[PDB]
Protein backbone atom coordinates (compact mmCIF):
# COMPACT_ATOMS: atom_id res chain seq x y z
CA UNK A 1 0.00 0.00 0.00
CA UNK A 2 2.89 2.45 -0.19
CA UNK A 3 2.98 2.67 3.60
CA UNK A 4 2.48 0.68 6.78
CA UNK A 5 -1.28 1.48 7.01
CA UNK A 6 -2.56 0.49 3.57
CA UNK A 7 -2.43 -2.63 1.48
CA UNK A 8 -3.51 -6.20 1.04
CA UNK A 9 -4.18 -7.97 4.34
CA UNK A 10 -1.88 -10.90 5.16
CA UNK A 11 -2.19 -13.25 8.15
CA UNK A 12 0.55 -15.43 9.65
CA UNK A 13 -0.86 -18.82 10.68
CA UNK A 14 0.79 -22.24 11.27
CA UNK A 15 4.06 -20.85 9.99
CA UNK A 16 2.77 -19.52 6.64
CA UNK A 17 1.33 -16.30 5.21
CA UNK A 18 -2.18 -16.30 3.73
CA UNK A 19 -4.80 -13.88 2.45
CA UNK A 20 -8.36 -12.79 3.30
CA UNK A 21 -11.30 -12.83 0.87
CA UNK A 22 -13.16 -9.59 0.05
CA UNK A 23 -16.52 -11.36 0.45
CA UNK A 24 -18.47 -9.43 3.12
CA UNK A 25 -15.34 -7.29 3.59
CA UNK A 26 -16.75 -4.12 5.13
CA UNK A 27 -15.57 -1.05 7.02
CA UNK A 28 -16.05 -2.80 10.38
CA UNK A 29 -13.71 -5.63 9.41
CA UNK A 30 -11.20 -3.16 8.04
CA UNK A 31 -11.59 -1.18 11.27
CA UNK A 32 -10.68 -4.29 13.26
CA UNK A 33 -7.63 -4.82 11.03
CA UNK A 34 -6.59 -1.18 11.31
CA UNK A 35 -6.95 -1.22 15.11
CA UNK A 36 -4.93 -4.45 15.43
CA UNK A 37 -2.05 -2.78 13.59
CA UNK A 38 -2.45 0.38 15.64
CA UNK A 39 -3.32 2.24 12.45
CA UNK A 40 -6.34 4.07 13.88
CA UNK A 41 -9.68 4.26 12.12
CA UNK A 42 -10.45 2.62 8.80
CA UNK A 43 -11.04 5.20 6.08
CA UNK A 44 -11.62 2.93 3.08
CA UNK A 45 -12.19 -0.84 2.65
CA UNK A 46 -10.87 -1.77 -0.79
CA UNK A 47 -11.87 -5.00 -2.49
CA UNK A 48 -11.14 -6.64 -5.84
CA UNK A 49 -7.36 -6.96 -5.27
CA UNK A 50 -6.97 -3.17 -5.39
CA UNK A 51 -3.35 -3.65 -4.23
CA UNK A 52 -2.68 -6.61 -6.55
CA UNK A 53 -3.17 -10.36 -6.26
CA UNK A 54 -1.69 -12.22 -3.28
CA UNK A 55 0.00 -15.61 -3.00
CA UNK A 56 -0.78 -18.67 -0.93
CA UNK A 57 -3.85 -19.57 1.10
CA UNK A 58 -6.90 -17.39 1.47
CA UNK A 59 -7.24 -17.68 5.20
CA UNK A 60 -10.54 -15.97 6.06
CA UNK A 61 -13.84 -15.35 4.29
CA UNK A 62 -17.30 -13.96 5.12
CA UNK A 63 -15.89 -11.71 7.84
CA UNK A 64 -18.54 -10.63 10.35
CA UNK A 65 -16.73 -8.52 12.93
CA UNK A 66 -18.79 -6.61 15.47
CA UNK A 67 -16.00 -4.00 15.36
CA UNK A 68 -15.05 -4.54 19.00
CA UNK A 69 -12.70 -7.51 18.52
CA UNK A 70 -9.09 -6.81 19.39
CA UNK A 71 -7.85 -9.28 16.74
CA UNK A 72 -9.19 -10.21 13.31
CA UNK A 73 -9.13 -13.92 14.18
CA UNK A 74 -11.49 -13.23 17.09
CA UNK A 75 -14.25 -12.18 14.67
CA UNK A 76 -16.98 -14.60 13.64
CA UNK A 77 -15.98 -16.34 10.41
CA UNK A 78 -16.62 -19.57 8.55
CA UNK A 79 -13.42 -20.77 10.22
CA UNK A 80 -9.79 -21.19 9.24
CA UNK A 81 -9.31 -22.23 5.59
CA UNK A 82 -13.04 -22.68 4.78
CA UNK A 83 -13.44 -20.39 1.77
CA UNK A 84 -14.77 -20.36 -1.79
CA UNK A 85 -12.81 -17.33 -3.04
CA UNK A 86 -9.76 -16.82 -5.22
CA UNK A 87 -6.88 -14.36 -4.86
CA UNK A 88 -8.55 -12.02 -7.35
CA UNK A 89 -10.87 -11.38 -4.35
CA UNK A 90 -8.18 -10.50 -1.78
CA UNK A 91 -9.28 -7.72 0.61
CA UNK A 92 -7.26 -4.61 1.44
CA UNK A 93 -7.47 -1.53 3.64
CA UNK A 94 -6.64 2.18 3.73
CA UNK A 95 -6.69 3.89 7.13
CA UNK A 96 -6.97 7.59 7.99
CA UNK A 97 -3.34 8.22 8.82
CA UNK A 98 -2.34 6.85 5.44
CA UNK A 99 -0.73 10.00 4.09
CA UNK A 100 0.27 10.88 0.57
CA UNK A 101 1.75 13.99 -0.97
CA UNK A 102 1.28 15.58 -4.38
CA UNK A 103 1.66 18.79 -6.30
CA UNK A 104 -1.56 19.92 -8.00
CA UNK A 105 -1.42 22.37 -10.90
CA UNK A 106 -4.38 23.82 -12.79
CA UNK A 107 -2.32 25.49 -15.53
CA UNK A 108 0.52 23.08 -16.39
CA UNK A 109 0.95 19.46 -17.36
CA UNK A 110 4.08 19.81 -15.19
CA UNK A 111 3.77 17.11 -12.53
CA UNK A 112 6.59 18.71 -10.51
CA UNK A 113 5.31 22.28 -10.04
CA UNK A 114 2.13 23.22 -8.22
CA UNK A 115 0.37 23.65 -4.91
CA UNK A 116 1.59 21.20 -2.26
CA UNK A 117 -1.31 19.07 -0.98
CA UNK A 118 -1.25 16.17 1.49
CA UNK A 119 -3.85 13.43 1.80
CA UNK A 120 -4.59 12.64 5.45
CA UNK A 121 -7.70 11.34 7.21
CA UNK A 122 -9.46 10.93 3.91
CA UNK A 123 -8.90 14.44 2.57
CA UNK A 124 -6.47 16.61 0.64
CA UNK A 125 -5.22 19.81 2.25
CA UNK A 126 -2.67 22.57 1.72
CA UNK A 127 0.67 22.91 3.52
CA UNK A 128 1.42 26.15 5.38
CA UNK A 129 4.31 28.29 4.14
CA UNK A 130 5.49 29.07 7.69
CA UNK A 131 9.04 27.85 8.48
CA UNK A 132 9.28 25.95 5.17
CA UNK A 133 12.89 25.83 3.95
CA UNK A 134 14.37 25.11 0.54
CA UNK A 135 15.70 21.95 2.20
CA UNK A 136 12.11 20.88 2.86
CA UNK A 137 11.21 21.60 -0.77
CA UNK A 138 14.19 19.48 -1.81
CA UNK A 139 12.85 16.69 0.38
CA UNK A 140 9.46 17.02 -1.31
CA UNK A 141 10.99 17.00 -4.80
CA UNK A 142 13.07 13.88 -4.02
CA UNK A 143 10.17 12.05 -2.39
CA UNK A 144 8.04 12.81 -5.44
CA UNK A 145 10.93 11.73 -7.66
CA UNK A 146 10.95 15.20 -9.20
CA UNK A 147 14.45 16.58 -8.49
CA UNK A 148 16.97 17.14 -5.73
CA UNK A 149 15.99 20.78 -5.22
CA UNK A 150 13.26 23.32 -5.89
CA UNK A 151 12.02 26.81 -5.11
CA UNK A 152 9.01 28.18 -3.26
CA UNK A 153 7.05 30.33 -5.68
CA UNK A 154 5.05 33.37 -4.58
CA UNK A 155 1.35 32.54 -4.48
CA UNK A 156 -0.93 33.97 -7.17
CA UNK A 157 -2.94 36.75 -5.52
CA UNK A 158 -5.70 36.23 -8.12
CA UNK A 159 -7.27 33.14 -6.45
CA UNK A 160 -10.23 33.75 -4.11
CA UNK A 161 -10.85 30.11 -3.08
CA UNK A 162 -9.94 29.06 0.48
CA UNK A 163 -8.54 25.53 0.84
CA UNK A 164 -8.39 23.31 3.97
CA UNK A 165 -4.94 23.31 5.57
CA UNK A 166 -3.63 20.35 7.61
CA UNK A 167 -0.14 21.42 8.79
CA UNK A 168 2.31 24.32 8.98
CA UNK A 169 5.84 24.96 10.31
CA UNK A 170 7.24 21.87 8.56
CA UNK A 171 10.99 21.71 9.27
CA UNK A 172 13.11 18.90 7.77
CA UNK A 173 16.73 18.21 8.71
CA UNK A 174 19.13 17.11 6.04
CA UNK A 175 18.76 13.34 5.78
CA UNK A 176 15.07 12.42 5.83
CA UNK A 177 13.57 11.09 2.60
CA UNK A 178 9.90 11.76 3.48
CA UNK A 179 8.24 14.82 4.98
CA UNK A 180 6.52 12.64 7.61
CA UNK A 181 9.71 12.34 9.66
CA UNK A 182 10.00 16.14 9.80
CA UNK A 183 8.71 17.88 12.95
CA UNK A 184 5.75 20.17 12.35
CA UNK A 185 2.66 21.54 14.03
CA UNK A 186 -0.09 19.09 15.06
CA UNK A 187 -2.91 18.19 12.69
CA UNK A 188 -5.29 21.17 12.64
CA UNK A 189 -8.06 21.64 10.05
CA UNK A 190 -8.06 25.37 9.32
CA UNK A 191 -9.08 27.58 6.42
CA UNK A 192 -5.98 28.77 4.56
CA UNK A 193 -5.58 32.26 3.25
CA UNK A 194 -4.32 32.17 -0.35
CA UNK A 195 -1.02 33.75 0.81
CA UNK A 196 -0.24 30.91 3.25
CA UNK A 197 -0.66 28.17 0.62
CA UNK A 198 2.67 26.62 -0.39
CA UNK A 199 3.23 26.60 -4.12
CA UNK A 200 6.57 25.12 -5.15
CA UNK A 201 8.32 24.53 -8.43
CA UNK A 202 10.92 21.79 -8.59
CA UNK A 203 13.62 22.76 -11.03
CA UNK A 204 13.41 21.37 -14.53
CA UNK A 205 14.27 17.76 -15.26
CA UNK A 206 16.46 19.22 -18.04
CA UNK A 207 19.54 21.43 -17.82
CA UNK A 208 22.36 22.63 -20.05
CA UNK A 209 25.89 22.30 -18.67
CA UNK A 210 29.26 23.85 -19.59
CA UNK A 211 27.91 25.87 -22.52
CA UNK A 212 28.85 29.51 -23.10
CA UNK A 213 25.23 30.59 -22.50
CA UNK A 214 22.23 29.40 -20.53
CA UNK A 215 20.77 28.24 -23.88
CA UNK A 216 23.79 26.24 -25.06
CA UNK A 217 25.45 23.23 -23.49
CA UNK A 218 25.35 19.52 -22.86
CA UNK A 219 21.85 18.15 -22.30
CA UNK A 220 21.37 16.61 -18.85
CA UNK A 221 18.14 15.00 -17.62
CA UNK A 222 17.07 14.19 -14.05
CA UNK A 223 15.78 10.63 -13.68
CA UNK A 224 15.88 7.95 -11.02
CA UNK A 225 17.25 10.45 -8.54
CA UNK A 226 20.35 11.27 -10.58
CA UNK A 227 21.47 13.47 -13.44
CA UNK A 228 22.35 11.69 -16.67
CA UNK A 229 23.19 12.37 -20.29
CA UNK A 230 21.65 11.74 -23.71
CA UNK A 231 23.43 9.68 -26.37
CA UNK A 232 24.02 11.34 -29.77
CA UNK A 233 22.68 8.29 -31.66
CA UNK A 234 19.98 9.70 -33.98
CA UNK A 235 20.44 13.06 -32.26
CA UNK A 236 19.19 15.61 -34.79
CA UNK A 237 17.94 19.18 -35.17
CA UNK A 238 14.38 18.24 -34.19
CA UNK A 239 15.65 16.77 -30.92
CA UNK A 240 17.61 19.97 -30.23
CA UNK A 241 14.49 21.99 -31.12
CA UNK A 242 12.53 20.04 -28.52
CA UNK A 243 15.31 20.52 -25.95
CA UNK A 244 15.41 24.25 -26.62
CA UNK A 245 11.62 24.50 -26.22
CA UNK A 246 11.45 22.87 -22.75
CA UNK A 247 14.03 25.34 -21.49
CA UNK A 248 12.12 28.21 -23.10
CA UNK A 249 15.07 28.89 -25.35
CA UNK A 250 14.15 29.93 -28.87
CA UNK A 251 14.61 27.80 -31.98
CA UNK A 252 17.44 25.29 -32.09
CA UNK A 253 20.39 26.61 -34.05
CA UNK A 254 22.65 23.55 -33.87
CA UNK A 255 22.64 20.02 -32.50
CA UNK A 256 26.22 19.22 -31.47
CA UNK A 257 27.70 15.74 -31.05
CA UNK A 258 30.78 13.88 -29.65
CA UNK A 259 30.78 15.68 -26.27
CA UNK A 260 32.02 18.94 -27.83
CA UNK A 261 31.45 20.66 -24.46
CA UNK A 262 33.08 17.85 -22.49
CA UNK A 263 31.83 14.49 -21.30
CA UNK A 264 28.90 14.31 -18.90
CA UNK A 265 28.41 12.16 -15.84
CA UNK A 266 26.41 9.29 -14.43
CA UNK A 267 23.96 7.14 -16.35
CA UNK A 268 23.28 7.72 -20.03
CA UNK A 269 19.52 7.82 -19.54
CA UNK A 270 18.44 8.15 -23.19
CA UNK A 271 19.67 6.69 -26.47
CA UNK A 272 18.20 6.84 -29.99
CA UNK A 273 16.03 9.85 -29.21
CA UNK A 274 13.73 10.45 -32.20
CA UNK A 275 11.59 13.50 -31.50
CA UNK A 276 9.35 15.05 -34.16
CA UNK A 277 10.14 18.56 -32.86
CA UNK A 278 6.54 19.23 -31.76
CA UNK A 279 6.51 17.29 -28.47
CA UNK A 280 5.95 19.18 -25.23
CA UNK A 281 8.76 17.32 -23.47
CA UNK A 282 11.78 15.17 -24.28
CA UNK A 283 10.13 12.46 -22.15
CA UNK A 284 7.37 12.34 -24.79
CA UNK A 285 9.70 11.34 -27.64
CA UNK A 286 10.10 7.70 -28.71
CA UNK A 287 13.36 6.30 -27.37
CA UNK A 288 14.93 3.07 -26.20
CA UNK A 289 14.20 1.97 -22.63
CA UNK A 290 15.35 4.43 -19.97
CA UNK A 291 18.89 3.85 -18.73
CA UNK A 292 19.75 1.21 -21.36
CA UNK A 293 22.55 2.70 -23.47
CA UNK A 294 25.46 1.14 -25.33
CA UNK A 295 27.00 4.62 -25.65
CA UNK A 296 29.86 6.15 -23.73
CA UNK A 297 30.07 9.71 -22.43
CA UNK A 298 32.15 10.46 -25.54
CA UNK A 299 28.77 10.52 -27.34
CA UNK A 300 27.18 13.08 -25.01
CA UNK A 301 24.71 15.29 -26.91
CA UNK A 302 24.90 19.09 -26.89
CA UNK A 303 22.73 21.94 -28.16
CA UNK A 304 23.05 25.57 -29.26
CA UNK A 305 19.79 27.57 -29.14
CA UNK A 306 19.00 31.20 -29.88
Amino acid sequence: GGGRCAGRVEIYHEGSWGTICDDSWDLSDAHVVCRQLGCGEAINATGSAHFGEGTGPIWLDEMKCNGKESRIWQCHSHGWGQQNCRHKEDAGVICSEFMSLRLTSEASREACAGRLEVFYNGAWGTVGKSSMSETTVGVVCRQLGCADKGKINPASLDKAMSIPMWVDNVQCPKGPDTLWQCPSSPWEKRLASPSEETWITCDNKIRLQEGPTSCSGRVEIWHGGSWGTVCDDSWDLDDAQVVCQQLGCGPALKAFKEAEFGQGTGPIWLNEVKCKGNESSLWDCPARRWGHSECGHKEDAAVNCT
Binding site: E62, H78, N84
Partner: protein, 144 residues
Protein backbone atom coordinates in the same frame (compact mmCIF):
# COMPACT_ATOMS: atom_id res chain seq x y z
CA UNK B 1 -2.29 -44.82 21.22
CA UNK B 2 -1.75 -46.07 17.66
CA UNK B 3 -2.57 -49.30 15.81
CA UNK B 4 0.06 -50.70 13.41
CA UNK B 5 -0.82 -53.22 10.68
CA UNK B 6 2.13 -55.07 9.23
CA UNK B 7 0.07 -56.33 6.27
CA UNK B 8 -3.22 -58.00 5.33
CA UNK B 9 -3.93 -59.67 1.99
CA UNK B 10 -7.07 -57.58 1.50
CA UNK B 11 -9.61 -60.38 1.16
CA UNK B 12 -10.34 -60.29 4.90
CA UNK B 13 -13.87 -59.53 6.10
CA UNK B 14 -12.70 -57.40 9.05
CA UNK B 15 -9.69 -55.28 9.94
CA UNK B 16 -9.39 -57.60 12.92
CA UNK B 17 -8.88 -60.41 10.42
CA UNK B 18 -5.77 -58.68 9.07
CA UNK B 19 -2.73 -60.41 10.60
CA UNK B 20 -0.15 -59.15 13.11
CA UNK B 21 -1.80 -55.84 14.01
CA UNK B 22 0.04 -53.87 16.71
CA UNK B 23 -2.04 -51.93 19.24
CA UNK B 24 -0.01 -49.18 20.88
CA UNK B 25 3.51 -49.45 22.24
CA UNK B 26 5.76 -48.10 19.46
CA UNK B 27 6.95 -44.57 19.31
CA UNK B 28 5.17 -43.43 16.15
CA UNK B 29 7.18 -41.18 13.85
CA UNK B 30 6.20 -37.81 12.36
CA UNK B 31 3.98 -39.18 9.54
CA UNK B 32 0.67 -39.53 11.44
CA UNK B 33 -2.98 -39.27 10.30
CA UNK B 34 -3.85 -41.61 7.44
CA UNK B 35 -7.31 -40.87 6.04
CA UNK B 36 -9.55 -42.80 3.64
CA UNK B 37 -12.21 -41.78 1.18
CA UNK B 38 -14.41 -44.77 0.39
CA UNK B 39 -16.60 -45.15 -2.68
CA UNK B 40 -19.74 -44.76 -0.57
CA UNK B 41 -18.54 -41.38 0.72
CA UNK B 42 -20.69 -39.76 -1.96
CA UNK B 43 -22.74 -41.93 -4.31
CA UNK B 44 -24.62 -40.36 -7.24
CA UNK B 45 -27.72 -41.73 -8.91
CA UNK B 46 -30.23 -40.46 -11.44
CA UNK B 47 -33.89 -40.74 -10.44
CA UNK B 48 -37.08 -40.14 -12.39
CA UNK B 49 -35.68 -39.89 -15.90
CA UNK B 50 -36.83 -41.91 -18.88
CA UNK B 51 -33.38 -43.48 -19.22
CA UNK B 52 -30.90 -44.50 -16.47
CA UNK B 53 -28.37 -41.94 -17.72
CA UNK B 54 -30.90 -39.12 -17.31
CA UNK B 55 -32.63 -37.87 -14.20
CA UNK B 56 -32.49 -35.84 -11.04
CA UNK B 57 -29.15 -36.24 -9.30
CA UNK B 58 -29.39 -37.66 -5.81
CA UNK B 59 -26.21 -38.32 -3.86
CA UNK B 60 -25.98 -40.50 -0.79
CA UNK B 61 -23.67 -38.71 1.62
CA UNK B 62 -23.25 -40.86 4.68
CA UNK B 63 -26.40 -42.99 4.88
CA UNK B 64 -28.77 -40.23 3.71
CA UNK B 65 -29.76 -39.40 0.16
CA UNK B 66 -29.93 -35.74 -0.75
CA UNK B 67 -30.63 -33.69 -3.83
CA UNK B 68 -28.16 -31.17 -5.20
CA UNK B 69 -29.27 -27.60 -5.83
CA UNK B 70 -29.11 -26.27 -9.41
CA UNK B 71 -26.83 -23.48 -8.20
CA UNK B 72 -24.37 -25.96 -6.69
CA UNK B 73 -23.66 -28.33 -9.62
CA UNK B 74 -21.34 -27.27 -12.44
CA UNK B 75 -20.68 -28.70 -15.90
CA UNK B 76 -17.42 -30.17 -14.59
CA UNK B 77 -19.27 -31.89 -11.75
CA UNK B 78 -21.81 -33.24 -14.24
CA UNK B 79 -18.93 -34.58 -16.36
CA UNK B 80 -17.49 -36.31 -13.29
CA UNK B 81 -20.94 -37.68 -12.45
CA UNK B 82 -21.56 -38.98 -15.97
CA UNK B 83 -18.15 -40.70 -16.01
CA UNK B 84 -18.54 -42.22 -12.54
CA UNK B 85 -22.01 -43.52 -13.41
CA UNK B 86 -20.46 -44.83 -16.66
CA UNK B 87 -23.07 -42.81 -18.56
CA UNK B 88 -20.60 -41.30 -21.05
CA UNK B 89 -20.42 -37.56 -21.66
CA UNK B 90 -22.63 -34.85 -20.19
CA UNK B 91 -25.30 -33.81 -22.68
CA UNK B 92 -27.26 -31.31 -20.64
CA UNK B 93 -27.79 -29.71 -17.25
CA UNK B 94 -31.41 -28.85 -16.47
CA UNK B 95 -32.55 -26.59 -13.64
CA UNK B 96 -35.99 -25.93 -12.23
CA UNK B 97 -36.96 -29.48 -11.18
CA UNK B 98 -37.37 -30.40 -14.85
CA UNK B 99 -37.54 -34.06 -13.74
CA UNK B 100 -39.69 -33.29 -10.67
CA UNK B 101 -38.92 -32.15 -7.13
CA UNK B 102 -36.72 -34.21 -4.84
CA UNK B 103 -37.76 -35.08 -1.29
CA UNK B 104 -36.15 -34.45 2.09
CA UNK B 105 -32.74 -32.86 2.52
CA UNK B 106 -30.99 -30.83 -0.17
CA UNK B 107 -27.22 -30.62 0.11
CA UNK B 108 -26.01 -27.02 0.49
CA UNK B 109 -22.46 -27.76 -0.69
CA UNK B 110 -20.72 -26.79 -3.97
CA UNK B 111 -18.53 -29.23 -5.95
CA UNK B 112 -15.36 -27.42 -7.15
CA UNK B 113 -14.30 -30.17 -9.54
CA UNK B 114 -11.55 -29.75 -12.11
CA UNK B 115 -13.42 -32.31 -14.24
CA UNK B 116 -10.76 -35.05 -14.40
CA UNK B 117 -11.62 -36.63 -11.04
CA UNK B 118 -12.75 -40.25 -11.10
CA UNK B 119 -15.37 -39.64 -8.39
CA UNK B 120 -17.15 -36.71 -6.75
CA UNK B 121 -15.77 -37.98 -3.41
CA UNK B 122 -12.36 -36.66 -4.53
CA UNK B 123 -13.75 -33.27 -5.55
CA UNK B 124 -13.22 -30.28 -3.23
CA UNK B 125 -16.38 -29.10 -1.48
CA UNK B 126 -17.23 -25.45 -0.52
CA UNK B 127 -19.95 -24.33 1.93
CA UNK B 128 -22.97 -22.70 0.27
CA UNK B 129 -23.09 -18.90 0.41
CA UNK B 130 -26.09 -17.73 2.48
CA UNK B 131 -29.22 -19.06 0.81
CA UNK B 132 -32.16 -21.43 1.21
CA UNK B 133 -32.41 -23.65 -1.83
CA UNK B 134 -35.73 -25.36 -2.45
CA UNK B 135 -36.64 -28.51 -4.33
CA UNK B 136 -38.19 -26.38 -7.07
CA UNK B 137 -34.61 -25.75 -8.24
CA UNK B 138 -33.19 -29.28 -7.92
CA UNK B 139 -30.66 -29.96 -10.69
CA UNK B 140 -31.08 -32.69 -13.29
CA UNK B 141 -28.50 -34.21 -15.64
CA UNK B 142 -28.67 -35.98 -19.00
CA UNK B 143 -25.60 -37.94 -20.12
CA UNK B 144 -24.69 -39.22 -23.58
Amino acid sequence: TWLFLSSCNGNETSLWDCKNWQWGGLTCDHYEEAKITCSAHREPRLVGGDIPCSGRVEVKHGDTWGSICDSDFSLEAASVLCRELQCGTVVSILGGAHFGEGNGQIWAEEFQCEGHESHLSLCPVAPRPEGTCSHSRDVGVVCS
